[PDB]
């Protein structure tokens, strides 16, 4: 995921795509032995009242 003399930051950690799908990053996603999720993120809805 990085090229040439390896000066630049690795493409998904620039929030670049992997295989045409966008990457999201955060510092509090990992718990236990689980460190990330891949899937159809259109399957989430949320709302806030007032």
């Amino acid at each position: 995921f990085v090229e040439s003399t390896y000066e630049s930051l690795t493409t998904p950690f620039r929030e670049g795509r992997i295989l045409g799908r966008p990457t999201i990053l955060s510092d509090h996603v990992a718990e236990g032995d689980v460190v990330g999720y891949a899937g159809d993120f259109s399957q989430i809805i949320w709302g806030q009242v007032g």
């Binding site: 509090h28 996603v29 718990e31 689980v34 999720y37 899937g39 989430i44 949320w46």
Partner: protein, 49 residues
Amino acid sequence: TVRANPANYLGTMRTKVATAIAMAFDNAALHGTNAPSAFQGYLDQSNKT
């Protein structure tokens, strides 16, 4: 304490609580840690790894 507002403690608490309320929604939605009965599922519940 509210007359003096030392270290801007009152203003600091308002921000610090707002972060805790946000982080609690993520811990609930992702890993289900304290999820209220009203939340339908949590992301970590999936049958695939």
